Symmetry: D3
Subunit: 259 residues, 6 copies
């Protein structure tokens, strides 16, 4: 659709159209690797998307192709940190969809993993690099990967640091669907619109519920936090707000203790 | 406070008054040990209390004293008690164990899984499993550790000693201690304080506490409460509203809040 | 298999034959949606199967086809509620197999998920509906689903509310096998018979062990509870009851402290 | 202490001295209840402290006493983007020790704030309790589960279901307050505790904090703990080969490093 | 009582009497700090105790007093490392009781923590030292300590590295009881005798159940492992062995599916 | 590969070459079932591999084929225990790869599961046997299996005790790749070599990180233990060691408190 520029950044591009935001890593001369400035700007853009009551879905992608003809989603750290960014993407009450063309490698692979969903172009290439280049992500990069592809495949991914095609990535369970390169944005927009027709409260509650299977008390904070928000929107929940407004004690005596 | 009989049982007594239910193990000649019939009746009475929209708090105790002047809450084993443990733990009403005299063996785990415990100062706590030929490695172990910490929980089970009411409060498993003649009255006061609270807030908090212990089963409770709350919102109304005007639900107007 | 009726209900059917029980959701005029009475009747039937010592396996299915030729397993929602039923199916020490012909949708899809196993007809259709119709299951419907199909696919299922074929369902890991519709019951019976020839104690312990990877202390309650039951059936564990009958303190002094 | 003002806000005060930051909720006319701006400012101050390499310890407190002589640490949400859940997470996860110095009321949302701080020092006049079920709210997140990891399941449920108030001495006995001191010694005690921490190894301290969160926060806790391991790795000889190799334009070679037991 | 030396070591002493073993760290000139050989020898002694069918309880203590009149249990660090030793003490199906006179400090403090129980002399002194001396134990030293004294107190212990008296330690929940130093061994023996009169199978199952609340799948391995052991001791269990004693398929057809 | 004998055993063979160790179960006349002697020797060999600083990868396999032409990896217990062995394979900081030709059955199936990775020959056969023969593994055999193939497939594997081909095993997620039997050792060696060129510290940290998603505090012990090891190798961590030598208090004053 007719995207409009939402904010200006050095290392990324940021657009909105209706209920969809699009965040584009824009360092194709570095295979869309993030430097600290890029992490800061990504974090800032995702915060903005979080603040916007109109935005229900964020598409995350890399600018491409580069002038060498190759595509990259994100190739990781360029040789707030990315852990802050991982947490924001994971916990924000909007659905984030990674649209991966070409390389999603290293820190860039973990970025795709922590997005709710991933749509891959058929030229996409996935994998980790840490043990080969001198790093590791033993956080969401390991445990959460295992909750997606299972323990055997997740260990293989990290120990060997091989590259995996889009088809292999879908088969192992870490990519939701694969489409041609020229259909990638359209597919992302279609999936976004399907989500945008849903109940925003139901969606945010489900996202918290999925996090709660992984994130212990931090997941409980998100899930219970949503319960509190819902409570505020009930008749019983509003008795507190109005009892104070009229300067009287709150009275919950008329409310049932449901089974 | 006028208790009135709610149901009749062989092994237990069951009363209600206002928003409080009282369940009384009534086998003082057996030190209030539970037989299979007793568990069934206890399960049935707790189900009734769960079903009654008027009841917010359940007081659980044992009849006493016996002819010899000494009390028992529940002395353990004479539908299984695991089912009963789960019902007490998960029902969206606050359960308060009122312990006079012995709370021992299966009877001690009974007090543990109640939300709160108020003890008479003559109360006696402890496990018997390893001594008599049994064990509770479920809530009797892990949940006990979430109350008194790992060192004390292991001591309780490995040695099978008896602990006074003051010791039980000191180690964190008893909320307060009063003379035996004030036990019921204390239970009533605490119940009344809970009964003036928001019922939805209380039930959500109970699920939240269970959720720190029971993994996905705990999530089922917490999330289940989120769904119930959602049904009571305008956005959650749109479902039924639509369900009733043969139109598609329409959530277009609703914000995506931060 | 010559089924005999074990108990009469309004909304469901309940048969037994040897070690197999069959529970049939019987509201095909409403696509086998459950009303509260349906849930109550389902709960009672499962309790009965739980309490019958000869029953080792329960087959859960939906009556079909409807007059229009279309099949339904369960289309979801039309005191005890479905959460109580979910727990009973999940924790009862007998294997429960969902036999899914046609739609397993909404609450009906979560019902299939919490059954130990799912055998699907090739016409079966799977999916959630909550965010689209005004509900959600953030309990076993989310977390447990993630333990079956992984986090990426589980989020996709809930956020988009699409429909999935039996074959797509098996591929993602949530259906154990797919057979033609006229072979579904016979496949269920065959799987049941293979289980019925196994050690009942081994089977119940394993079911508890699987639940223990999900349900924290409640899972431990099942696993440890099974350990206690086994303990009672041992010589050392019989000494307690024996000593009590001989009116003497239990004596364990001869028993070794094994490594 | 020679405090210097680090930044100006409307609802709070923010000071630094050596390796200590002090964040003071400053709405004593509202019993130090937070409104949205207060939460924004607290978040900003804690971010600043996290970013300052010199700061190892943050003391969190409320200005007092009010005109009527009553003290408040924080009385929760003001009944007159970022919410306190974001603030709870920042305090919990930032790799600096946060000590709540509680004079008077730490109530409602203000009670949960004290809980998520690493440590709590209470004045003799401190009062603790939740209010949600009474006023029409609840915190089923760190306010419940984390509270249970501090005082145990029995006392935690009591605190929430009855919404009573607890003295400093009671809070210490139940395990949620680290020590109790006279109110005119409260700041001194905080500074002293801060100083003992500031003489420790910063890496060891941050790894420990992550290790404690890891007992509670599942994979998010793993992210912090493993995140610290990655950071430590970067500071080892073997971890440096990656950087050296890139800067010498050559394949990283780990061939000579042992596989230790 | 009349201890008998079980095996000779350089850095420790190892005794047995009846169902009790006693392991004594014996480097009082080093405040009973452990060097690598000490850890090796302790591991060997605990292994021997695990393998001895007559031994139900191990008392762990430090030799004292030193010639300057001061006592030490263990003052911390002076192949196998202490992490292996921590795991063995924690998982072995015998009850381990730390008997602490004087200093239990640094790695020595964690050693007391991972023992099932701790009895302290009134002269005992507890605390951590890592952040002060240049180390940390973020494993059982942190998380498990929090399962004993709560999160507030556990953090204080580690961040400040102060020393705590026996009374303070008991009050915070990490010491089970406090006795005068000249009653310390006697108290340990009495507790051991009380455990030794219990059912060994019940004790080992409970120990596994406690670990299972902390150690995820590793805890499940212990608890389920005990269930398997109990199963082998049942009639239904023995059918497997006996059906193999006769080379005829195992037949579990007569066994009920209990509720 | 120029294998050299590392140690001599009755029931197994043990070789090293460069950074690779190879452990071969050598009872083909018993379809490579393990007796207690076999478990002991396997434990000892894996311990030796853990201790050898040159060894980064261990290949575990069964000798084959037997004289009848059929292959076995390990057929389970032969009609220190295997739980100790499971723990050692799972926690040791070297990558273990199961190379499965023919049957990996019963206890032998769980053995393949707990290895980091599995490469199967296309003649490989996988399955559990417990409920059929009179046993069960409700520890890593259940829960960890579920973390690999999902809850539905894992329950099917145990409840029915069927046999699965190599292709079926790969499809469900528990086998990493499948090759002809005459390529099995070469494929294992190739995977080993790719791991051996990686950073050993990164690899061991990742292995602990994966275990930490399963093993609660025991997993934290491994992951935090690696953090402590890394800390000792930093400048700041060295101050502790240097300060003790110079008879002085450690001085951490110059070190920053990083964000
Ligand atoms: Cl109290
Ligand atoms: Cl002061
Ligand atoms: Cl999985």
């Amino acid at each position: 659709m007719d995207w409009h520029i939402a904010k200006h950044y050095d290392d990324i591009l940021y657009y909105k159209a209706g209920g969809i935001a699009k965040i584009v890593i824009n360092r194709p001369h570095k295979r869309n690797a993030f430097r600290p400035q890029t992490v800061f700007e990504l974090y800032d853009a995702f915060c903005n998307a979080r603040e916007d009551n109109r935005i229900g879905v964020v598409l995350l992608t890399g600018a491409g192709p580069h002038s060498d003809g190759k595509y990259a989603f994100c190739s990781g750290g360029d040789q707030l940190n990315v852990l802050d960014l991982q947490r924001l993407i994971r916990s924000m009450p909007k659905v984030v969809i990674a649209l991966v063309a070409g390389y999603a490698i290293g820190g860039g692979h973990v970025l795709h993993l922590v997005c709710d969903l991933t749509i891959a172009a058929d030229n996409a290439i996935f994998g980790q690099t840490g043990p080969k280049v001198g790093s590791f992500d033993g956080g969401f990069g390991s445990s959460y990967l295992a909750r997606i592809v299972g323990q055997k495949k997740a260990r293989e991914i990290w120990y060997l640091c091989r590259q995996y095609s889009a088809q292999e990535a879908e088969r192992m369970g870490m990519v939701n669907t694969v489409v041609p390169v020229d259909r990638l944005e359209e597919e992302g927009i279609q999936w976004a619109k399907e989500i945008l027709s849903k109940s925003p409260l139901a969606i945010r509650c489900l996202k918290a519920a999925f996090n709660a299977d992984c994130d212990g008390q931090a997941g409980l904070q998100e899930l219970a936090g949503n319960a509190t928000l819902l409570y505020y929107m009930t008749e019983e929940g509003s008795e507190g707000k109005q009892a104070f407004l009229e300067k009287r004690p709150p009275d919950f005596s008329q409310y049932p203790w449901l089974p």
